[PDB]
Amino acid sequence: EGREDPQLLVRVRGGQLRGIRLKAPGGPVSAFLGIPFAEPPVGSRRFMPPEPKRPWSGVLDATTFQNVCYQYVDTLYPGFEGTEMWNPNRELSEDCLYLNVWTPYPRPASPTPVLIWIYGGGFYSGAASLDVYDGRFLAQVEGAVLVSMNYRVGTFGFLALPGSREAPGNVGLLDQRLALQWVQENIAAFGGDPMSVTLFGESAGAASVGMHILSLPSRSLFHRAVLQSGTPNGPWATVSAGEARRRATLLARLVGCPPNDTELIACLRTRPAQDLVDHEWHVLPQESIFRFSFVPVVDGDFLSDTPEALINTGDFQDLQVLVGVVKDEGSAFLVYGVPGFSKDNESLISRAQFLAGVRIGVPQASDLAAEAVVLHYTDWLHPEDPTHLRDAMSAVVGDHNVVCPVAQLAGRLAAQGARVYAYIFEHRASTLTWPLWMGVPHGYEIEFIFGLPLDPSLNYTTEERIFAQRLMKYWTNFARTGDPNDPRDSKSPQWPPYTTAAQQYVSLNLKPLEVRRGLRAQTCAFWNRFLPKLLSAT
Amino acid sequence: EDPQLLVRVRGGQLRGIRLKAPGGPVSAFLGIPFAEPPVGSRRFMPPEPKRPWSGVLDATTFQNVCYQYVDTLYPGFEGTEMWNPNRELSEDCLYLNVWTPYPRPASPTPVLIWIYGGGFYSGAASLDVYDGRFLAQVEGAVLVSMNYRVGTFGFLALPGSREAPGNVGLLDQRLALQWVQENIAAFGGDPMSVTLFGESAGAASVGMHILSLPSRSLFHRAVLQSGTPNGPWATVSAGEARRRATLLARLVGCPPAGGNDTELIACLRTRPAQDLVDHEWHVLPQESIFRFSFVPVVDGDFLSDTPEALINTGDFQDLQVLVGVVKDEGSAFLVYGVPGFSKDNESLISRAQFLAGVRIGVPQASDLAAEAVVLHYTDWLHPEDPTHLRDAMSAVVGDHNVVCPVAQLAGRLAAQGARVYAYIFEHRASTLTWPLWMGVPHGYEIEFIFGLPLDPSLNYTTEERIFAQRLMKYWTNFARTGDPNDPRDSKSPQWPPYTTAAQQYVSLNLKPLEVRRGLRAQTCAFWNRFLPKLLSAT
Ligand SMILES: Nc1ccc2c(c1)c(-c1ccccc1)[n+](CCCCCCc1cnnn1CCNc1c3c(nc4ccccc14)CCCC3)c1cc(N)ccc21
Ligand SMILES: Nc1ccc2c(c1)c(-c1ccccc1)[n+](CCCCCCc1cnnn1CCNc1c3c(nc4ccccc14)CCCC3)c1cc(N)ccc21
Numbered sequence A: 001e002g003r004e005d006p007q008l009l010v011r012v013r014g015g016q017l018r019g020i021r022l023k024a025p026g027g028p029v030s031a032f033l034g035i036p037f038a039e040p041p042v043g044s045r046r047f048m049p050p051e052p053k054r055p056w057s058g059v060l061d062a063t064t065f066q067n068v069c070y071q072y073v074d075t076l077y078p079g080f081e082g083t084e085m086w087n088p089n090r091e092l093s094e095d096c097l098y099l100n101v102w103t104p105y106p107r108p109a110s111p112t113p114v115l116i117w118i119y120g121g122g123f124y125s126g127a128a129s130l131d132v133y134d135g136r137f138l139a140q141v142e143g144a145v146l147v148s149m150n151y152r153v154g155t156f157g158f159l160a161l162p163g164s165r166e167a168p169g170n171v172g173l174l175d176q177r178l179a180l181q182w183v184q185e186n187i188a189a190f191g192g193d194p195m196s197v198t199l200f201g202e203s204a205g206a207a208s209v210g211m212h213i214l215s216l217p218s219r220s221l222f223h224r225a226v227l228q229s230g231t232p233n234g235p236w237a238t239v240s241a242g243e244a245r246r247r248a249t250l251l252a253r254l255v256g257c258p259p260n261d262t263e264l265i266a267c268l269r270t271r272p273a274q275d276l277v278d279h280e281w282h283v284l285p286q287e288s289i290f291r292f293s294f295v296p297v298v299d300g301d302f303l304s305d306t307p308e309a310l311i312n313t314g315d316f317q318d319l320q321v322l323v324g325v326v327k328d329e330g331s332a333f334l335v336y337g338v339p340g341f342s343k344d345n346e347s348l349i350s351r352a353q354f355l356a357g358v359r360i361g362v363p364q365a366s367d368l369a370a371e372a373v374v375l376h377y378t379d380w381l382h383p384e385d386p387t388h389l390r391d392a393m394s395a396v397v398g399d400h401n402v403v404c405p406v407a408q409l410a411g412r413l414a415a416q417g418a419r420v421y422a423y424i425f426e427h428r429a430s431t432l433t434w435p436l437w438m439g440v441p442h443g444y445e446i447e448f449i450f451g452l453p454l455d456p457s458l459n460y461t462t463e464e465r466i467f468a469q470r471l472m473k474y475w476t477n478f479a480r481t482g483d484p485n486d487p488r489d490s491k492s493p494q495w496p497p498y499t500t501a502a503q504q505y506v507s508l509n510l511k512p513l514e515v516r517r518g519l520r521a522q523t524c525a526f527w528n529r530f531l532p533k534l535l536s537a538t
Numbered sequence B: 001e002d003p004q005l006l007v008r009v010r011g012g013q014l015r016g017i018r019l020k021a022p023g024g025p026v027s028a029f030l031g032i033p034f035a036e037p038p039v040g041s042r043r044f045m046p047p048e049p050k051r052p053w054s055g056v057l058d059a060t061t062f063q064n065v066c067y068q069y070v071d072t073l074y075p076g077f078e079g080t081e082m083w084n085p086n087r088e089l090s091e092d093c094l095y096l097n098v099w100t101p102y103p104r105p106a107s108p109t110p111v112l113i114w115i116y117g118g119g120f121y122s123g124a125a126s127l128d129v130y131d132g133r134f135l136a137q138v139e140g141a142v143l144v145s146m147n148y149r150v151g152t153f154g155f156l157a158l159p160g161s162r163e164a165p166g167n168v169g170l171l172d173q174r175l176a177l178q179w180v181q182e183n184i185a186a187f188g189g190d191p192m193s194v195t196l197f198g199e200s201a202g203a204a205s206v207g208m209h210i211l212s213l214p215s216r217s218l219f220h221r222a223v224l225q226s227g228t229p230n231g232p233w234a235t236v237s238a239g240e241a242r243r244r245a246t247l248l249a250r251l252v253g254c255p256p257a258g259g260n261d262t263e264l265i266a267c268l269r270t271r272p273a274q275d276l277v278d279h280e281w282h283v284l285p286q287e288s289i290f291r292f293s294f295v296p297v298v299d300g301d302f303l304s305d306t307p308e309a310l311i312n313t314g315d316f317q318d319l320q321v322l323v324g325v326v327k328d329e330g331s332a333f334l335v336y337g338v339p340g341f342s343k344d345n346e347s348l349i350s351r352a353q354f355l356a357g358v359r360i361g362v363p364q365a366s367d368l369a370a371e372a373v374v375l376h377y378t379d380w381l382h383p384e385d386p387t388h389l390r391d392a393m394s395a396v397v398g399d400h401n402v403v404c405p406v407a408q409l410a411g412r413l414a415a416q417g418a419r420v421y422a423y424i425f426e427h428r429a430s431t432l433t434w435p436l437w438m439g440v441p442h443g444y445e446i447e448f449i450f451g452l453p454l455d456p457s458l459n460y461t462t463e464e465r466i467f468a469q470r471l472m473k474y475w476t477n478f479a480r481t482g483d484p485n486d487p488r489d490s491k492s493p494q495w496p497p498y499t500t501a502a503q504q505y506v507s508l509n510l511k512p513l514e515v516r517r518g519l520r521a522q523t524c525a526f527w528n529r530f531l532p533k534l535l536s537a538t
């Protein structure tokens, strides 16, 4: 420091940081990007829990996003924006444990509500540095302090040989918890209130938020939670200890590490990062969609039991949760290897192709369970209609994997004392490059919650700008108070809590809030009450 | 003596009576013997043709009702007693009734043949709601109805035996049909244009004449109202008939070299009728509803295979069929043994009471299967609501027993070249004495089709008189041409044929025809395609 902007120099437990003054449309914000919160989990630390970052000397430059955690880079549609906007935007490296902070400029005098973001990507991909997770707009417009962290994904984050000490599993979640601890100790330097931290995240991020709710050591690290299109309960977010062992062992075998656990993990540790990525997909038990190879494991430690069990028996009185879904959770998953589906045509499939899709979509399902699915989704007035079948296949994937789990989550939490608010997101970005048939796909509310439309250079409609402001007010009003509603406002339709009695939730679209009752009530009875029993008995 | 009232049929001369209809006189020939009384050693045997008689046979009154159980659920109550025997009970009961216009029709008239229901254990052609004069007078039709043996006498079978081959009640019907072919021309009727029509068990009987080759040259068109030959109640197997027969024999003291078929039937024949009727309801294998002890048997004779198999493989190309259901097929059955239901209160039920009702409603169901019915029929927005649960219990019984068997029948006949018209009857008689919650119960379209609202002394509303005139036209139009539509009248809308593609059918109520699509399609897919896979797999 001599000629430096005094609002950009800030000390934290690890040492001095230099941030950057960023332009948001309404004014400047402060970003501190690439703050390390753990010892780089490289070398002999691969697969291991993270250690807190050792203090540095001098002023650490925090003006740019740091490395993205090793993963599989999507090459489904090369050059296509629809897939590439999710692809890593920094170098890949095992040295990736860094977090980012956006605060108002100047930093606010009194403590500000803190929002912590946890990216999705199936526990195999993602980065806090993507354009759509840009904390600058929430920071500038809502006066909020926003934090996002990188956490280890794929094998690096979730390969477990359970009961082992050198590869215990859930270390991706432990990175996330370590970043939360960082926020407790340090966020006050940035003008954040560590007594008011809301976690929010989408897809696997949502699943992660829910896992912090269900893991006791995480509970004292945040006060409120938002789960966007993901849950800890459900078919894809966790695996049994047994299944994780099988997957770990198979992967080892594939990369030239034949199986004693010490020997095996030692040998995995000598493998180049790329070789692990190059093989992670080969360990899934069936051809399937919306399943990921290395995900949180039920270890009897981070997760003391299956999320299904923990949500059925938990006391959640102290807890406030906002949850919800987009209109077409399944559609995007179809183009990742369901025969018949593509972004470049209308994806009008046949009945054969539907039955085939369903086996892949519900891989754990017997023949009889698969017929049940098909019979339930068939339109019996037009059982051959290619359009309806295309949409059914999307709804099967969406409902089984997201909507109905969210429904179950909302039900159990609300019965057991939580204040729950629920939504369905129904607006298709005017700028989406995915075809019309895909509707509102998995992930596409995020850019609205973050306020991207306010950036005039992004070509959102004026209507979309206003809509984004609303959503930003809902989310942050929820962070601030535990209620997405506005204290001053006065019809303005109110957003009612979700209860078991009334099952109210709101539609989020360009029109003002409409209250609806029953989140796919009948169809979710199928997945949550019936289907299990078609595996319980046969 | 009135020349109009004197007819010479094959077995001798008859004297009918001139009856009074609101719009003019009709000739009626009531109580014509069509078979040797099936008594003594003829009990359980095929009927024999009636021997010729001398002089002029008095045919001016209804003859005896076939021997049957008399309802005492609600003694003195019109709603039940209107179905009870209105003439003396006797095993001597094989008589038929003919109504014609007065004067005798000048040129050959379409002939309608009625077959009552009563679950194959009750019924009589003499009931007021089967009064054939209105159709005779107004539409210029020749309307015939026969008595046939019911309960043990009509359907007790020891398959493979000469003495009790089963299905004799159907043979009774067949003989009545043969009688119409040989004799109806003398009445002005046209034997080359005979339309069978019937309701409930009567409809199933009609169905069985469609499905049995010898019956096929005795009529040209068919109308099945609220009943089908396929389904869970209309037939039993040779093994199951034997079982019930053998159990009945045992219950009435039979038996104390032959043997053990001839022996057993011999002893049964020695028993007073009331002894057989005393013990008929004790042969059923479970607590159930809409199951009857003695029903047509799959014998490989009358029925060459199961109706379900027969309808699957039949060629139905020169066949016209009118089928339908009432709005509330199941409601009436609930007051007959289903705990929680009664005509004297609104019958609001608990969920537990709903589950218990399902086990009785679907006697063959396994735990899982019954659970599926329950979970399918629940309203997940108000799953505890007593009105819905009561209505759902009603719907389960109607759908399982009538509506979905109809849908299936309609579908197969149309698929296989038959020409099918379908309806749902939704108007509740203003004169009705069953409570409102029962809606339009099983049986209560009949009074309208027969034109009773034309009798001003019966206190039907003007609207109902007009409604009855329309239905009388639909039915007799259908009898005349195989098409219920008014062939010379324009403006409609038209009753289109039922087809497997478009699944079109109409509602009959006070409003003009409305064309709907899919006869309870999703729900019948549950009943016709899924549940069967849940019986014979787990
Ligand atoms: N050429 C093929 C053929 C078959 C399969 C392929 C590739 C891939 C694939 C592998 C590496 C990189 C990308 C895809 N996967 C792996 C999993 C694919 C999951 C796709 C969606 C998703 C879910 N969470 N993360 N992602 C990856 C893409 N990131 C997105 C994300 C989100 N939304 C969207 C919406 C549209 C497109 C992408 C996208 C929101 C949350 C975060 C990431 C499959 C998985 C299977 N179980 C079966 C087939 C295939
Ligand atoms: N006290 C108990 C307790 C348990 C059971 C009882 C009686 C009876 C019963 C038998 C003879 C007479 C009266 C009742 N049934 C026999 C099944 C009878 C079904 C009654 C409804 C019906 C339907 N179609 N015919 N009927 C019989 C009477 N005639 C009717 C007719 C019609 N509609 C109706 C509508 C309401 C009342 C009666 C009725 C239409 C067609 C022809 C006859 C049961 C059958 C079971 N599977 C289980 C329990 C019970």
Ligand SMILES: *[C@@H]1O[C@H](CO)[C@@H](O)[C@H](O)[C@H]1NC(C)=O
Residues within 6 Å of the ligand: A339, A340, A341, A342, A344, A345, A346, A347, A348, A349
């Ligand atoms: C869409 O394209 C894919 C491959 O490009 C193909 O498999 C599919 O059949 C196509 N659908 C239609 C309706 O042409």
Ligand SMILES: O=S([O-])[O-]
Residues within 6 Å of the ligand: A081, A082, A083, A085, A431, A432, A433, A434
């Ligand atoms: O590129 S957008 O369509 O995700």
Ligand SMILES: O=S([O-])[O-]
Residues within 6 Å of the ligand: B078, B079, B080, B082, B431, B432, B433, B434
């Ligand atoms: O049976 S009575 O209500 O017409």
